[PDB]
Amino acid sequence: ILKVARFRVLKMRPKISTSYRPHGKWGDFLACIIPLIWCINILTNSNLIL
Amino acid sequence: SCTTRRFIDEKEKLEYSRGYNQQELEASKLRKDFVKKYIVDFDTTLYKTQVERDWAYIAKREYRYEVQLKSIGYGGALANAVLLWRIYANKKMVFWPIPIVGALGYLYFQPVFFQKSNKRFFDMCNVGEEYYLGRERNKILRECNKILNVEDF
Amino acid sequence: ENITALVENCKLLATKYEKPQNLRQAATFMKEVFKLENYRKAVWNRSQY
Amino acid sequence: PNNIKGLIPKTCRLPATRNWYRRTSSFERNGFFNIHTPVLNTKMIPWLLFIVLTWGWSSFQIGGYNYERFDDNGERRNTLYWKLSPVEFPQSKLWNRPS
Amino acid sequence: GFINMIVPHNNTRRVASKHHMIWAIYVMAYMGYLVWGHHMYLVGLDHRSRTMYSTITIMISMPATIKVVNWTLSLVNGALKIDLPFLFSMSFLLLFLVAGFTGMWLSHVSLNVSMHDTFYVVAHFHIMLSGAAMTGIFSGIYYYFNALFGVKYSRMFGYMHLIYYSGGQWVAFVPLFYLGFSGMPRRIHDYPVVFMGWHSMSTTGHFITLVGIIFFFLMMFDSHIERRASTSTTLGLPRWYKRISYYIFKIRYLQHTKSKMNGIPGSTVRLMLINRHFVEYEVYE
Amino acid sequence: MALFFMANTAISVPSVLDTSP
Amino acid sequence: YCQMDPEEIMRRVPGITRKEAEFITKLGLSPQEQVDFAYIAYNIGLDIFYFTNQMFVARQVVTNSKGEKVEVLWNAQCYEDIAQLNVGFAPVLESVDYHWEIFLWADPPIKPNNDFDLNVPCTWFEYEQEWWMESCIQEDQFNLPEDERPYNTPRNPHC
Amino acid sequence: MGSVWFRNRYWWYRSLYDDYVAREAKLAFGIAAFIWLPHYYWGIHLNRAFEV
Amino acid sequence: AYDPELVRLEKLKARVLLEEEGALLEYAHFISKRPYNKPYEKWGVSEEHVKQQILG
Amino acid sequence: MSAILKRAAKYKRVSSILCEGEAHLRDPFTPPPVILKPPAPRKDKKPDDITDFPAQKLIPLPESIPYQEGKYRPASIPMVAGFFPYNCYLQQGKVYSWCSCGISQSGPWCDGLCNSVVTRCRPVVFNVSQSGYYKICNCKFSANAPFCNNTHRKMVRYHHQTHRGFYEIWGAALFVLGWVYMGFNYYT
Amino acid sequence: LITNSYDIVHSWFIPGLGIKLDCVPGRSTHHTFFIDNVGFYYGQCAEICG
Amino acid sequence: LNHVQNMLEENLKYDAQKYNDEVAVIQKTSRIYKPTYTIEFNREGEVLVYSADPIKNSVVYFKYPYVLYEAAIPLFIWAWIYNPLELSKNAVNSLLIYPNIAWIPRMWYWRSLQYKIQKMYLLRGGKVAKIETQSLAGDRFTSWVETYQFHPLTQDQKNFDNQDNAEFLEDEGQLKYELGVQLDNLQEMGTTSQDIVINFMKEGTVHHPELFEAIVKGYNIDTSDYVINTANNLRAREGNHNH
Ligand code: HEA
Ligand code: FES
Ligand code: FES
Ligand SMILES: [Cu+2]
Ligand SMILES: [Cu+2]
Ligand SMILES: [Mg+2]
């Protein structure tokens, strides 16, 4: 939030984005670890309680 | 419980404000000696009985928090004040005052704290005659009761 | 109204004299501003208003 | 009053180093009244820390510490023995938390 | 999709992962056909069926995290041009943040058994639907106000609507979630007096939301009374994919700013006037 | 839960000592 | 107001028209950007006097392999939202016209497909495809000064 | 941890998202540890109460 | 970068230890002016000094 | 001005070679430096006139450069992309293009992506007369052309010397130490 | 507890025990209950009974 | 609202009209200096005047004003934790205010460190000067400013020094003191800010000192005798000893 609100505005360090196409391959699986951890924790807690 | 702990702490503060007497002072000295020897400087893991070890560890944690930690905090506050004054004088950050005044304050407030919760720590030693620590605590309590002409528990 | 009068007198004084350089200078400037008979007349008129 | 002892006469504009408060809004020479300035960003950095970071990780804990210190976790006084009584735990559902 | 379309034009940057987001939406749609038993966990189905339903419900959050990450990443490292649409998109993202957490917490079997068909579920449903969906609808309305209406939006009343509407949703959903944590049953005609505070807070939030709706209607009326042509902030170049394009955009922006800032008093004159504003003195020379 | 979910194991909590006469 | 000396720009870009620099110096960009724009105009033959409007965003003159002096009107585009695209027939910036029929003549838009065989390497300023990410990485990197870089080490025995 | 573990960070960068927030990540990690201390202390106290 | 007055006192003490001509006299005279709270002469040019002059 | 003229009698000039040196000294492709005296001012400034200053020689960007014998300096500051050299097994006599862009997605070999980004560095074509597992530079700042001059360590030290780099490294270490402290206080 | 409904789908929702037995007609729901805390807890029909 | 009359308002309106009519953007210049040496501008048509690394010459971690509050925060933390004064919950919460504000002075000092002109160059024509600095986060920011925008300040910096006849440098060219100079409007990152004071440190090197004094004096320089240095010795964002 701070970086976008201080160095991303037009009057403060704008950037010329030359991005014709995205080329991500493992981003979703890499970021999915956080949801996986929450799911595992919830499942463990439920199985313990149930 | 939490209410019991609050009541104990407040009563200890009120008693320390009221006075320390002479027979009470001698009893406090004896209790401090007992706590330092058998609890504070004695590793709780060395006790024979596991239950005795658990009770001694609880008492040791209480001493570490209520006496050691509180005295360290008071000494740190005094050291911060002294270091602030010194840095104001020299207009620069010194290094000796922090440790020196911290050690001095720990030494000073170490007894005062031990002066306040002297009875309370003793209250954590009543394991019972089934433990050697319990027998020694019972003997010490009997000596203190003989000194003070009052029946403690 | 009293605040507005004091602020206007302070603005006039700043247009007349340089800004205070220290705490003692600020105290002296405040005393000088408060001493203004213009400030007193402004206090009276602003009290009526 | 022309002569004022203790007040040096004003002779010219002083450099900005004599100002007692750094203003935020600035004037763009095209006539604009710009609020978003580097000084504005610098001033906005502090307060955002108090709301986004500080309170979001200290408000609930501070409140619990104050309550347990002063209210004893809201316990009823007429109980028999702590050995055989239900323990009234302190605050556990974080008020600052959305859930 | 509305939020994703709104964000790309405002930041003049490419989306984070378009193919990944499309595939995630399709996978979420495919997965939604297997969460039937999730809403009927307390009906007492076979334990195998309950376990399968719970496992499918927990795994559904995998696509949503991808979408949130893609939105957050696309919002960064771009040329932000703040419009009224951008604030609504941010509000929609913020509302969607809490709803996902509430749904994931409700996915726990024990928590669901402790809160099935209650004010917690009511809050989850409302914040997921009344907040996120209506906020996105309003955002798309503001994002395409010109083409639909033919006139530029009213800045002040639009800001008032975006302020009052965003606040009302949280004001009415926080007390509901609090009562859900207290276990207030859903669809109840009356409650014990212990729920009065939270109920009153929720009612006040609903009234604030109604006031915000009235403000949006007044915004529509003001936009109709304004009758001023709107100009695309992108100026025909929504992406500065080239240095020449960026330079041309900068030159045109400077020219349009100079033309727009015409007739406004100069900086020096405005400063002089502002300094000489106070003209009420008691005695003169 | 998890391997480290509560992040704190209160091993100091001892069994309540019975004090019947 | 950081206008540079046109001769310097003329020195920076051999082949640029002096008046153009005077037009360039009146643009209002910092001298580095002004020099870059002048170089770009000199290389691509861009007409720097044409106003950027709704019909044609820019005008350019070129000489094809047939030798004809042709003109290319670089028109405005949209971010995949034709409804958001201001369809106009005037040299203005405002969106005033609202044609009820998107395709009055019922001709749908045609998105031409460039076959793989009939394709040429990117030559429209391909030297900046990854410039954004590269500059982000460079700004995110602190470089060891050349005064500290070791020099004249032993050559590789098999090199 | 971060770009160090990979041999071609650029590739790695793209291979996630083609976006860069590295400085934000580093400052955030530092502040996160510095803030995570207190909730840990409070949770320790609460867990002790629960065990009691 | 911290204490110019202390640097000067150190120079005087070094001269005294090396047993210069003045030595004791100069070291005593500079010591005769040893105030309790020395001023922080190293005031920053970019640092704001008006509102921060009290602590000096 | 006039008083300044007086001060001109004693004012001295200093060269600006600082922290960069003479690039022509290190890069063989970089021509030796020259000092060009501007021509006399033109009498009539016409709109259609062109500049008359002497033209600098045209040095086109080479597609690839030969492997300088340990005396290769970066043309433009390349991407860091790694703090550990890569031990790659190269067959003898096979011309391999060591990447210099730093954005090459095809490992140590050049990926041709250099021709798509704004930088002066081009890949270096090298040939090893003896096959084997040689340590190819990954710091992209090794004085030795294909070989890692262990200057990765120097770059890491310089980064650790920087305030922001020190802050980042210390924050990562602090998070690891926080995890360690949580583990240490776990059983309590 | 053999939960069942005589007329329509009702619910015994003891918030204190955190339990909610969905009494449906014909469905003899055999559910386990363990009162791990001595106490009096309140509850109501967690279904719209009419 | 115009029905009421004030002669002060009338005078102000007349003065505003006079300023709008007479004071124009195009203004004649008189302070002109012809240098005593032919200047060899760099490949980018620039001549360096002052080079400095104030960050390398600054005490960053242990500063004078910030250290006091930064250390005193623990005292308030301890007072709040231990409740030594036995106050109320509200009073303790109030006592907690001090630690949340201690960052302001250190932040202000760090921001102030960014305003120092690390590098200064004069472009061809002698009208615009490029000043480059580096924010302590390592953010290299450069800006071109007009020649007329500079005004010197005294060595004590308590009063604006005379725009002419100032002696802020040694005879050989080295700066006589760490100098402060006010700029009426500086376009930092494209955003114009008003009345900003920059500082040139004594540790800097005054290359070609005479022109620097002309830059200090603010007079426009006659760039007649100019040579071109053909040496691309500067790299894109080349690493600098200031970091
Ligand atoms: C459009 C509306 C909408 C949406 C999007 C959702 C999305 C989800 N819903 Fe539900 N739901 C309803 C509308 C919706 N829901 C309605 C109306 C009911 C009630 C029907 C009735 O009345 O009975 C209901 C009921 C309902 C129940 C049972 C309530 C009851 O018993 O009836 C459950 C529990 O499993 C559930 C789960 C979920 C989950 C797990 C998601 C997931 O898709 C969302 C979870 C996704 C995330 C978690 C990603 C968020 C990303 C993050 C990274 C969050 C982490 C952030 C922080 C912790 C800061 N929903
Ligand atoms: S230098 Fe990297 S692709 Fe050629
Ligand atoms: S990787 Fe070691 S010096 Fe290049
Ligand atoms: Cu019912
Ligand atoms: Cu019912
Ligand atoms: Mg239900």
In chain C, after which residues is the C-to-N distance over 2.5 Å, breaking the chain?
Answer: none
How far CA E181 is from CA of D67, E97, E198, J92, in Å, comes to 21, 19, 11, 72
CA pair distance L108, D47, nearest whole angstrom: 14
The continuous run of DSSP H or E covering K21 comes out as strand K19-23
Rounded distance between C-alpha atoms, residue E218 and residue L126, angstroms: 57
Cβ J101 under 6 angstroms from ligand 2 = yes
Q: J121 Cβ partners below 8 Å, 6+ apart?
A: J74, J75, J76, J78, J100, J101, J102, J114
Q: Whose CA is closest to J169, among J185, J183, J158?
A: J158
Distance CA B144, CA B138 (A): 10
- Residue J137 tokens read as 């530079």
CA distance L73 to G41: 59
**DSSP annotation string for chain L:** --SS--HHHHHHHHHHHHHHHT--S------EE--SS-EEE-TTSEEEEEE--TTTTS--SS-HHHHHHHHHHHHHHHHHHH-TT---HHHHHHHTTGGGTTHHHHHHHHHHHHTS--EEEEETTSSEEEEEEEETTTEEEEEEEEGGGEEE--TTSSSPPPSSS---B-TTS-BSS-EEEEEEEEEETTEEEEEEEEEE-TTSEESSHHHHHHHHHTPEE---SEEEEE-----TT---S--
Residue L239 has its nearest CB partner, among G4, G7, G146, at G146
Please tell me the experimental approach by which this structure was elucidated: cryo-EM
Is A6 close to D45, i.e. CB distance below 8 A?
yes
Q: What is the DSSP letter of B69?
A: I
- Between CA L166 and CA J7 the distance in angstroms is 11
A-chain residues within 8 Å CB-CB of E21? none
Q: Are C40 and E283 in contact (CB under 8 A)?
A: no
CB E149 within 8 A of CB G98: no
CA dist list (Å): D91 to D64, D82, E195, G50, I25: 6, 19, 19, 70, 70
- Closest residue by Cα to residue L200 from L108, L120, L145: L120
Pairing status of strand L150-152 against strand L119-123:
unpaired
Distance in angstroms (rounded) separating the CA atoms of residues L101 and D43: 12
In whole angstroms, what is the distance from residue K3 CA to residue K26 CA? 10
Determine the 3-state secondary structure of J34 from DSSP: strand
**Identity at H24, one-letter amino acid code:** E
Asked whether K11 and K45 are in contact (CB, 8 A), the reply is yes
Start-to-end CA distance of chain B, whole Å, equals 19
Do residues J23 and L231 make contact, with C-beta atoms less than 8 angstroms apart? yes
Radius of gyration of chain J (CA): 25
Q: In what order do the strands lie in the sheet with L39-41?
A: J34-36, L226-230, L39-41
Nearest CA to ligand 1 atom 9: E103
Interface touch C38/E280, C-beta < 8 Å: no
Residues L173, J9 contacting (CB under 8 angstroms): no
- DSSP for residue E80: B
Q: Is E19 annotated as belonging to a binding site?
A: no
CA dist., res. H23 & res. L135, Å (int): 14
Q: Which two tokens stand for residue E13?
A: 């940057």
In chain I, what residues touch B90 (CB-CB under 8 Å)? 3, 6, 38
Q: Give the chains touching J; criterion: ≥3 Cβ pairs < 8 Å.
A: F, G, H, L
Nearest CA in chain L to I42: L64
Cβ partners under 8 Å of residue B144, min gap 6: B27, B30, B31, B152
Q: In this structure, what token pair is assigned to residue L193?
A: 């800010």
Supply φ then ψ for residue B26, to 5 degrees: -65, -40
Spell out which residues of chain G touch residue A3, defining contact as CB-CB under 8 Å. Answer: none
The CA-CA-CA angle for residues L152, L155, L156, to 5°, reads 115
Atom 6 of ligand 1: nearest residue by CA position: E128
* Nearest alpha carbon to residue B101 among B75, B121, B137, B127: B75
For residues G91 and G55, is the Cβ–Cβ distance under 8 A?
yes
**Which position has the token pair 């190269």?**
J90
Residue K22 half-sphere exposure toward CB, CA atoms < 13 A: 16
Q: Taken in order I11, I13, I16, I18, is the CA torsion positive or negative?
A: negative
Q: What distance in angstroms lies between residue K49's CA and the mean position of ligand 4's atoms?
A: 4
**Length of chain E as a residue count:** 285
D48: nearest CB among A2, A9, A11: A2
- H9-16 helix and G131-139 helix, angle to the nearest 10 degrees: 120
Residue with tokens 């905090």: B73
Q: What is the DSSP string of G119-137?
A: -----SSGGGTTHHHHHHH
What amino acid occupies position E73?
A: L
Q: Nominal resolution in Å?
A: 4.2
Residue in I2, I37, I55 closest to B89 by CB: I37
Taking the C-alpha atoms of residue B97 and residue B119, their distance in angstroms, rounded to an integer, is 34
Cβ atoms of E164 and E212 within 8 Å: the answer is yes
- Which one of the ligands is nearest to J153 CA? 3
Q: Name chain G's partners: 3 or more CB pairs within 8 A.
A: A, E, H, J, L
Helix (H, G, I), strand (E, B) or coil at K16: coil
Contacts of B87 in chain L (CB under 8 A): 67-68, 71
Answer whether L153's CB lies under 8 Å from L161's CB: yes
Residue E73 in contact with residue H19, Cβ under 8 Å? yes
Q: How far apart are CA J165 and CA H23, in angstroms?
A: 9
Say which residues have a Cβ less than 8 Å from residue E119's Cβ, sequence separation at least 6.
E176, E177, E179, E180, E182, E183, E184, E185, E186
Identify the DSSP state of E133.
I
- How many angstroms separate the CA atoms of E147 and G145, rounded? 55
CB within 8 Å of L80: residues ≥ 6 apart: L92, L95, L96
For I:1-56, CB contacts with B below 8 A are 2-3, 6, 36-40, 55-56
